[PDB]
Each structure stands twice: as C-alpha cells, then as structure tokens.
C-alpha cells in the first residue's frame, strides 16, 4: 500500500535508501567490505522522532552483530553491556566511571541511598559495584573488587569468591555441577530469604549461580527494560547444558515465549529492540510494518545480510510494486537481493521476478540492453547484475529475451520484436522481420508520398532501419553467415526498390527507369521478355510480388513523363520515343497477363497511362 512517488519526502528517502542498496550490491559483486548498517546508522542519526530513534538503535544492534559468529544470546548480552558501559562513559578507569555512576544515581539529595540495606565499605556499595561491573561486561574487574574486599565480607560470602573465580575463568560462564549445587544450597539457606539483605548481593548470586530460576527478576535493581532483558539473557542456557533439567531450566525459547506473551504493551518504546535482541527476527520485521514499510523492508535486508532469517522474496517483490514502471533499474536492484538467503528456491524466485519485470514493464532497453551503432550489444542492468544471480548457465537472459520477442510479435509490436530478436542474436529472424516491414511499407504507402523525412531515424523508419541492418550485419562474417542467402538478397532488392521510389518522388524519370531495369523484374528487354517475366511471377518471393504493381506504375509514369519531355530538339528523338513506347508495351503485355493476381485497380491505372503515350 506504499507509493514511493507520492511526495518529495517519501521520494527522497527512497532514492537515499536505494542508493545504499545500490552500493551494497556493488560491494556484493566486488567482494567488498561495505557495511549497510553503518550507512543506515549515518542517515538515521540525523533524522528523528521516536520511531527513527527506535529504528536507529535497531541498526546499531545489527551493526554490533557484524563479524561475530552469531549466538543469539551472546550478541544480545554483548549489546546491552556495551551500551551500559558507554552510558556510564557518556555520564562521566571503567571501575571509577561506574563508581561515579553509582554515587550519582543511587544516591538521593540527602546523600542517602535510594536502595536500602546496601553493604557500604568506604562509602562504596561494593555489591552494587560488582553488579554494575557485570552489567558492563567487565567480569574480571567485578571479580577483582570482590577479591580486594575479601576481608570485609565475613565467611558466608567468602565461599562465593571461589564460585566467582570459577565462573570468571571459563568460556561457558557456567559452573561445574558440584559448585552449582553448593552455591544453590548456600543461596537458599542464607541469601534468598534474608531479612535485610543487600539486593545487589542477591542479584549477583542469582546471576553468577543461576540460583532459583523460578524467580527471574530482582525488581529492586531492575531499573530499565535493558536491565530486564540483560538479566533474563544472563540466565539462559542451551537445553543440553542444563545440569538439573527436571528441577529447573531456562532456554532461549522460554525467553521468547514470555516476550511474546507480554506483547508490545509491556515493552514501552523498546519492543522492536526487544524482538531483535530476543532473536525474533520475523516478528521484528512484522512489527516494523505497523509503522514504516520502507524501514521494514530494509531492516529485513539487514537481517538477510547477516543470514539471520513475511518471506524475503515477497518482501522484496512487494516493495518493488509502486516503482517497477517508474524506476525499472532500482526494481532490479531490490529483486537481486533475493539471493541473500542463498536458497534452492530463492534463485528461481529471483529469476521469475525478473522475468515478470521484463515482460510487464516492457522496459527492454534498460533491462535487457540495446544495440550500439556498430552492432555491438550494450549490456542491460539484468546482465550487469548477472554475478549476483548465481547462474549455472547466460541462458536465462537469452530465454527471457526470446519470450519477450514472441510476445512482441503476437502483440504487433514490430519494432520491439526487431529489437528483441537482435538482442537474442536471432539474426535471420531479424532480416525476415525487417524485409517484411520494408516490403509492406513499399507496397502500402501511397505512391506519391515520401518514404523518408528529414527527422526520421534508423530505429523507426523502415527504409532507414533496413539500410542500417544491411550495413551492420551483412559485412560481418560471423553474423552474415547466420542469415540465409536469399534473405540478404530480398533485403538488397527491397532497398533498391526504395531507391527507385525516392528517385521517382524526386522526378528523376530517366534515372528511375534505368534503375528499374537493373532490378531485372520487369520486361524491358524485348517482346519475349513479357512472356518470361509473366512466368516468373508465380515464383517471386512474397515480399516482391506485392511490389510489382507500383513498379509497373512507376515505369509507365516515368515513360509518360519522358515522352512529353522529348516532345518539348534532337536527331534521334523519334528512336528514343519508339524505344520508350516499346518498354511500355512490353510492360503492359506483362501486366495484362498477371493482372488477376494484382489489385483490381492496377491494370486500369496502367492502361490509362499507356494510351496517353
């Protein structure tokens, strides 16, 4: 339901977006380094409004994912941590910048703490420090601060230091089952139900140990949606890495199920980010559709660029619909994105979309190419993007050109068909069509009208076209070989006829008559020529038979004018008039023998001229 051309604003981002999509394909083909996310990051940062900031952060989410082997849970946590860390940098060692964030926003104007029961050592809430270090991804710093405070945390928490070192010195960020059972017992016996317990201490225990998965949120320290997302993401394990699945478990699907069950109602100005961070990529695309088709389409391209994946091919072919006619080349640019998913049906779906674009817009020269002045083909945009099509083939291009050609012929688009058959390199068919077009022009265009005007060209004028095809093809051994010898001959004969018609139109009677005799079609020679040419008539090519009537009319008319000219002196005027009258006579006898295969008016036109001689 989107129409890109309906206003300056809605048309300016389209080309701005299409231009990114364009150099993406360029690096795609050039095997380059282009990164679409940071291009949309650049354009989206200047704009604003809430959805734009929403969209802007979503691309920064996609950008962070780049060059990372993609584990949904891991990249999601890395995003939320690096964002918080940079937040504490914007606000201002990392440890001292987090310390200052703590002293600032955890304290009321009294210098009182907003959270009660904080364990405070030298004015530093050490469990809040450990926690926010973890919240920033600074695991080794977080373990560090716990270590320095070993002499200030009694013995109940002393054991926790060993579980932390273990959690920190690993890659799985999991604990050996002997540790997770010990830590869970200690959590249940001392921490979980503590009366005056520090809430950050409880959060850190729960995060490091995955203690008590029945309660996933610590609301007292969950100060933002990002915190809620991070804390859940922190608790997810793979199914095959659950130490005690019948007691408790938490997987990514569990996390996605509750995000879905809550819906956007519970996710404020953050639902698109939440869907993206939870790995619900289709839902994030679908949600984006509710407010901007253009940004939805392009977010899908971003997600396809990352191999993350309504259906891509239909997403891309639907976006194209409002500008297929207006902008055929950029339509190709988006249809070619269909092979980002690299699927067995994706390649075929992209082919069928391209074929539909060509057959429907009939934009043959931009999409399929055109013939240069020398006869050499200039590639169209589909051909220029052939690498991106993953073609086994160039067979595809050939096949679509031939289909457009037969449709052209069926529709009566003669010029289209001649252009397409040239592109398909169907050279004998081209000369066949050109001969048919020139022959029909010569026989059907009223005789006294001119055939070529000062502003006619080789693309649309039948005489100028045939001349161009003869010049660029017949003297090209590679091409000329492929044109039947008689099709070449019919072409040159028709062209000689068109030269005769021009001389005639220009009142060059004598020279018209001389070129006429060189055709070797009419009986100029003697009495018996009429009989010979009459017999030949039934064997003439279809292209020629229909032009015999005008040739007879030109001949009789040229003789009639030349006899008047001779009678208005010279020694042998009589012999030249007798000779001319002889040609008229032979032509009239020939004409009378073939006249019932001629138009019914031809003979009558002819003999009315003959008796004036």
């Amino acid at each position: 339901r989107l129409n890109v051309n309906e206003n300056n604003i809605l048309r300016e981002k389209f080309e701005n977006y299409a231009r990114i999509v364009f150099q993406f394909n360029n690096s795609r083909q050039a095997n380059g380094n282009f990164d679409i996310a940071n291009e949309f990051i650049s354009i989206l940062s200047s704009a604003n409004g809430t959805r734009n900031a929403q969209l802007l952060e979503s691309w920064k989410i996609l950008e962070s994912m780049k060059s990372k082997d993609i584990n949904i849970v891991e990249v999601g946590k890395q995003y939320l941590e690096q964002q918080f860390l940079q937040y504490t940098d914007n606000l201002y060692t990392n440890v001292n910048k987090i310390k200052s964030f703590i002293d600032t926003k955890l304290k009321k104007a009294d210098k009182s703490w907003k959270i009660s029961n904080l364990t405070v050592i030298n004015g530093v809430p050490i469990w809040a420090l450990i926690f926010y270090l973890l919240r920033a991804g600074l695991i080794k710093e977080a373990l560090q601060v716990l270590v320095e405070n070993k002499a200030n945390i009694k013995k109940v928490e002393q054991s926790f230091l060993t579980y932390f070192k273990a959690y920190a010195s690993s890659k799985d960020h999991g604990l050996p089952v002997e540790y997770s059972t010990k830590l869970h017992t200690e959590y249940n016996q001392h921490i979980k139900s503590s009366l005056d317990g520090d809430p950050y201490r409880l959060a850190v225990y729960k995060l490091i140990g995955r203690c008590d998965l029945s309660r996933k949120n610590i609301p007292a320290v969950t100060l933002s949606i990002e915190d809620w997302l991070w804390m859940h993401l922190m608790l997810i394990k793979e199914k095959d890495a659950e130490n005690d699945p019948v007691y408790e478990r938490y997987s990514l699907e569990d996390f996605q199920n509750i995000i879905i069950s809550y819906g956007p109602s519970r996710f404020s100005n953050y639902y698109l980010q939440t869907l993206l961070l939870s790995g619900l990529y289709g839902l994030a695309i679908d949600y984006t559709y509710t407010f901007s088709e253009m940004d939805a389409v392009h977010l899908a391209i971003g997600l396809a660029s990352l191999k993350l994946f309504i259906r891509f091919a239909n997403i891309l072919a639907n976006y194209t619909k409002s500008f297929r006619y207006s902008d055929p080349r950029v339509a190709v640019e988006y249809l070619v994105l269909i092979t980002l998913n690299e699927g067995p049906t994706d390649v075929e779906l992209c082919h069928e979309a391209l074929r539909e674009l060509v057959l429907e817009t009939k934009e043959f020269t931009v999409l399929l190419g055109k013939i240069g002045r020398d006869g050499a083909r200039i590639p169209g945009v589909i051909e220029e993007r052939q690498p991106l099509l993953h073609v086994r083939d160039k067979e595809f291009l050939h096949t679509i050109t031939e289909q457009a050609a037969r449709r052209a012929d069926e529709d009566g688009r003669i010029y289209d068909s001649i252009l397409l058959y040239q592109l398909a390199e169907e050279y004998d068919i081209v000369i066949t069509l050109v001969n048919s077009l020139l022959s029909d022009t010569l026989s059907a265009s009223d005789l006294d009208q001119p055939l070529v005007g000062p502003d006619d060209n080789s693309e649309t004028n039948p005489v100028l076209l045939a001349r161009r095809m003869a010049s660029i093809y017949f003297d090209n051994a590679g091409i000329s070989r492929q044109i039947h010898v008689k099709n070449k001959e019919i072409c040159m004969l028709l062209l000689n006829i068109s030269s005769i018609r021009e001389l005639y139109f220009n009142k060059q009677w004598q020279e018209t008559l001389s070129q006429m005799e060189l055709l070797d079609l009419l009986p100029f020679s003697d009495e018996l020529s009429a009989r010979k040419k009459a017999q030949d008539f039934s064997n003439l090519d279809d292209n020629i038979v229909k032009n015999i009537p005008n040739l007879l009319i030109i001949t009789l008319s040229c003789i009639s004018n030349m006899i008047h000219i001779l009678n208005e002196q010279s020694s042998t005027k009589g012999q030249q008039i007798d000779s001319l009258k002889n040609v008229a006579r032979q032509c009239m006898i020939y004409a009378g023998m073939i006249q019932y295969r001629m138009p019914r008016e031809t003979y009558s036109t002819l003999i009315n001229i003959d008796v004036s001689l």
């Epitope: 068919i429 069509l433 001969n435 048919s436 070989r481 492929q482 099709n487 001959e489 020629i544």
Partner: nanobody
C-alpha cells in the same frame, strides 16, 4: 515445437514422392525452414531451404529434381521429389534452417524414403 513429417516410403527408381511436414508450437512464419536427409552411415545434410517469403535454395545433389515449398496458413513445409535415385535413399527431416546442421538439436521423427532398383 513439433515437426510431424509424413509422406514418403518406398518407391522405384525414377519415380516420384512428396514429403510434407505439419508443424506446431512455434511461429512458423518467421523461420527459414529446411529439409535434411541422413543416409545410413553418412551424416545429416541440408538438401533444400526456403525463406519466410518462399525464396528457395537447393543443394547441387538435388537441383532441378527437388522442389521445396511452404504453406504459412497451414504451417506445413513440403518437398516434391521427382526422378528419384537410390542415392537419395535416407531418412528425411524438416527443421529450422541453420548454417551448420549439427547445431539444431531439436528435431522430429522423420520419414524414411527408400528408392529401389
């Protein structure tokens, strides 16, 4: 495309035969068409060809004796063969004319023509 060659069969030397080919499934009018023969052992060779407009051209082998024609209304091609010789015995195929016979790769079943004596 489909090429249904009929006509022909066995005939005594010096006799006459008329081959025909009913076509379907392509636009007949725009194509130069040809009649070919394939003698046992020998390769398939071009015997006669005809442009869209009815202009014809013949191999020396059959000049004066064979006559190719076409009917663009009925989408048929025909080959009248007169004063036949046993050297003309072969299977005869009708197909689009092309400069090098090997490249066709899209034919019909053909009609066998055999001339005795």
């Amino acid at each position: 495309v489909q090429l249904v060659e009929t006509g022909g069969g066995l005939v005594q030397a010096g006799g006459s035969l008329r081959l025909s080919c009913a076509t379907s499934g392509f636009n007949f009018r725009l194509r130069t068409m040809g009649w070919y023969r394939q003698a046992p052992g020998k390769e398939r060779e071009l015997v006669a060809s005809i442009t869209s407009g009815g202009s014809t051209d013949y191999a020396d082998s059959v000049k004066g004796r064979f006559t190719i024609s076409r009917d663009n209304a009925k989408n048929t091609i025909s080959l009248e063969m007169n004063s036949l010789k046993p050297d003309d015995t072969a299977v005869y195929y009708c197909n689009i004319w092309a400069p090098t016979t090997a490249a066709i790769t899209n034919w019909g079943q053909g009609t066998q023509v055999t001339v005795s004596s």
